[PDB]
From Swiss-Prot, chain A:
A helicase/nuclease that prepares dsDNA breaks (DSB) for recombinational DNA repair. Binds to DSBs and unwinds DNA via a rapid (>1 kb/second) and highly processive (>30 kb) ATP-dependent bidirectional helicase. Unwinds dsDNA until it encounters a Chi (crossover hotspot instigator, 5'-GCTGGTGG-3') sequence from the 3' direction. Cuts ssDNA a few nucleotides 3' to Chi site, by nicking one strand or switching the strand degraded (depending on the reaction conditions). The properties and activities of the enzyme are changed at Chi. In the RecBCD complex, RecB has a slow 3'-5' helicase, an exonuclease activity and loads RecA onto ssDNA, RecD has a fast 5'-3' helicase activity while RecC stimulates the ATPase and processivity of the RecB helicase and contributes to recognition of the Chi site. It comes from the Bacteria. Transmembrane segments: none annotated. This is RecBCD enzyme subunit RecB. It comes from Escherichia coli (strain K12). The chain holds residues 50 to 147 of 1180 of the full protein. Heterotrimer of RecB, RecC and RecD. All subunits contribute to DNA-binding. The C-terminus interacts with RecA. Interacts with YgbT (Cas1). The N-terminal DNA-binding domain (residues 1-929) is a ssDNA-dependent ATPase and has ATP-dependent 3'-5' helicase function; both are stimulated in the presence of RecC, suggesting this domain interacts with RecC. Holoenzyme reconstituted with this RecB N-terminal fragment has no nuclease activity. The C-terminal domain (residues 928-1180) has weak ssDNA endonuclease activity as an isolated fragment. RecD probably interacts with this domain. The C-terminal domain interacts with RecA, facilitating its loading onto ssDNA. Interaction is decreased by ATP. The holoenzyme may undergo conformational shifts upon DNA binding: the nuclease domain of RecB may swing away from the DNA exit tunnel in RecC. When Chi DNA binds to the RecC tunnel, the nuclease domain may then swing back to its original position (that seen in crystal structures), allowing it to nick the DNA 3' of the Chi site and then rotate to load RecA. At high Mg(2+) the nuclease domain may swing back more frequently, explaining differences seen in assays performed at high Mg(2+). Disruption phenotype: Decreased degradation of DNA with free ends that is unable to undergo homologous recombination, which can fortuitously lead to more efficient viral infection. Cells are deficient in DNA recombination repair and have increased sensitivity to UV light. The cultures have many inviable cells. Cells cannot be transformed with retron Ec48-containing plasmids. Belongs to the helicase family. UvrD subfamily.
Curated annotation (Swiss-Prot), chain B:
The holoenzyme may undergo conformational shifts upon DNA binding: the nuclease domain of RecB may swing away from the DNA exit tunnel in RecC. When Chi DNA binds to the RecC tunnel, the nuclease domain may then swing back to its original position (that seen in crystal structures), allowing it to nick the DNA 3' of the Chi site and then rotate to load RecA. At high Mg(2+) the nuclease domain may swing back more frequently, explaining differences seen in assays performed at high Mg(2+). Disruption phenotype: Decreased degradation of DNA with free ends that is unable to undergo homologous recombination, which can fortuitously lead to more efficient viral infection. Cells are deficient in DNA recombination repair and have increased sensitivity to UV light. The cultures have many inviable cells. Cells can be transformed with retron Ec48-containing plasmids. This is RecBCD enzyme subunit RecC. The lineage of its organism: Bacteria, Pseudomonadati, Pseudomonadota, Gammaproteobacteria, Enterobacterales. It comes from the Bacteria. It comes from Escherichia coli (strain K12). A helicase/nuclease that prepares dsDNA breaks (DSB) for recombinational DNA repair. Binds to DSBs and unwinds DNA via a rapid (>1 kb/second) and highly processive (>30 kb) ATP-dependent bidirectional helicase. Unwinds dsDNA until it encounters a Chi (crossover hotspot instigator, 5'-GCTGGTGG-3') sequence from the 3' direction. Cuts ssDNA a few nucleotides 3' to Chi site, by nicking one strand or switching the strand degraded (depending on the reaction conditions). The properties and activities of the enzyme are changed at Chi.
Length: 98, 62, 147, 62, 125
């Protein structure tokens, strides 16, 4: 991607509510594992190993994952019906809704 | 914003929490402003777990 | 329908003299006015009914009528609302407001009848607890205070 | 507790020092509750939903 | 002089507040003690802790920082009304007036598309 992004700027849409809470905790755990792997510089998993190979500066990346870990509460994973509800309530005047 | 006041006179009274229970261990670390988490930066630190704080199995605090 | 009958009666209340000194409510300046005091009076040991009314009835003539007060053992903080507190001639006073009395108009409010209802609604203990409050507040706030 | 801004509010666009948000209020409340406990701390949450027997997750603070 | 008291727990600050009132007592008896609290339960805990030591707690004002400072405005500067003309309540009815008047101002035209569709006046409120 052209620029690094913030957790609150990533939009994930899953139709089932139970899958949105599982994917939120699944991403929350994968950010925590990769953050520790960046500080340890070594990992026992192939995916995180190939990620550490592409990582240029592991120190700044670990700080980004730490800020990404603290924002997972407002991390956006919504359903189709849970999205429009939050989006139409964000900008009211364009939608013309109470 | 409190430390930005020019004419303010600041004085502190802090009761030291003697760590015993797991609860008093965390309140300590937050009070003394120290990081007790072991990240395991090197394999020598990653192996021995004795460098952490001992936890009693009978502690119901946390 | 009320206001013509109200603004008059209100003037009769503010102009009425009080006690011996004949203090009129209109003579009180805002400096000496304290309205709606909320006090917290802690009770340390558990308060027993029989252990209380015996002391009450002892020194208080109004506690002779009616049976002894009946309440469960209570230990904690006591709450209350003082309607008005004011000082005049360097002497503090205690004021409370009651209305009730649906059926009576004429002299049926008298020295014997008012005290008869004070014993009926158990307002005896109320001002006795209000004075203990005010005594502790005046003792705490005023340096070198005497009852 | 999630309270979203009105979306046309200018304060959320350029935050300052003394700006108050409900997210930072509840996050700081969890820290106030942690230091306030002098003996025992009790934290409970639903791990598994009793209806469909699925998996839930505790708050990020916990 | 403005003094800031830092402490690990509230029980030390409450005991320090007990010492400040104990060392110096107010001349006028009826002058209330100003204590700023953001909620009711915080004020009700201070009343029970102060009454537990001194023996009673009475005449303690517990306003909000917004109401306090506003009350400080009327005392320091004359001509200020005791309650302001701009509130969360009155400004809603005042805007319910101007907003139908301010439509088609060449600025509000973005807001005009939200209202002029149709309403029972609920959208305006």
């Amino acid at each position: 991607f052209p620029r690094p992004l913030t957790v609150e700027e990533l939009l994930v849409v899953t139709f089932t509510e139970a899958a949105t809470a599982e994917l939120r905790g699944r991403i929350r755990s994968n950010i925590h594992e990769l953050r520790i792997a960046c500080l340890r510089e070594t990992t026992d998993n192939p995916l995180y190993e190939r990620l550490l190979e592409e990582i240029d500066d592991k120190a700044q990346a670990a700080q980004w994952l730490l800020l990404a870990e603290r924002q997972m509460d407002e991390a956006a994973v919504f359903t189709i019906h849970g999205f429009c509800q939050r989006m139409l309530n964000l900008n009211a005047f364009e939608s013309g809704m109470l | 914003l409190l430390s930005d006041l020019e004419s303010s006179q600041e004085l502190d009274a802090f009761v030291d929490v003697t760590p015993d229970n797991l609860l008093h261990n965390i309140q300590s670390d937050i009070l003394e402003l120290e990081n007790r988490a072991v990240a395991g930066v090197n394999i020598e630190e990653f192996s021995r777990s004795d460098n952490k704080r001992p936890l009693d199995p009978l502690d119901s605090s946390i | 329908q009320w206001e013509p009958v109200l603004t008059e009666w209100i003037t009769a209340v503010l102009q009425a003299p009080l006690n011996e000194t004949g203090v009129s409510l209109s003579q009180l300046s805002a400096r000496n006015k304290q309205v709606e005091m909320e006090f917290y009076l802690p009770i340390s040991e558990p308060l027993i009914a029989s252990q209380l009314d015996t002391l009450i009835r002892q020194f208080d003539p109004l506690s002779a009528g009616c049976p002894p007060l009946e309440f469960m053992q209570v230990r904690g903080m006591l709450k209350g609302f003082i309607d008005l507190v004011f000082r005049h001639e360097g002497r503090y006073y205690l004021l409370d407001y009651k209305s009730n009395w649906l059926g009576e108009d004429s002299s049926a409010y008298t020295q014997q009848a008012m005290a008869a209802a004070m014993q009926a609604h158990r307002y005896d203990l109320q001002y006795q607890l209000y004075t203990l409050a005010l005594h502790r507040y005046l003792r705490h706030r005023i340096a070198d205070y005497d009852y | 507790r999630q309270l979203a801004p009105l979306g046309f509010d200018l304060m959320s666009q350029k935050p300052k020092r003394g700006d108050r948000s409900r997210r930072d209020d509840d996050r700081y409340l969890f820290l106030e509750a942690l230091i306030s406990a002098q003996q025992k701390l009790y934290i409970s949450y639903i791990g598994r939903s009793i209806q469909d027997n699925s998996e839930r997750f505790p708050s990020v603070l916990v | 002089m403005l003094r800031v008291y830092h402490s690990n727990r509230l029980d030390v600050l409450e005991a320090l507040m007990e010492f400040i009132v104990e060392r110096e007592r107010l001349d006028d008896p009826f002058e209330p003690e100003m204590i700023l609290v953001q909620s009711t339960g915080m004020a009700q805990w201070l009343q029970m802790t102060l009454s537990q030591k001194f023996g009673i707690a009475a005449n303690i004002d517990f306003p909000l920082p917004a109401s306090f400072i506003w009350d400080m405005f009327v005392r320091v500067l004359p001509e200020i009304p005791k309650e302001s003309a701009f509130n969360k309540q009155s400004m809603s009815w005042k805007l319910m007036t101007l907003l139908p008047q301010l439509l088609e101002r060449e600025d509000f035209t973005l807001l005009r598309h939200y209202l002029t569709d149709d309403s029972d006046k609920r959208k305006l409120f």
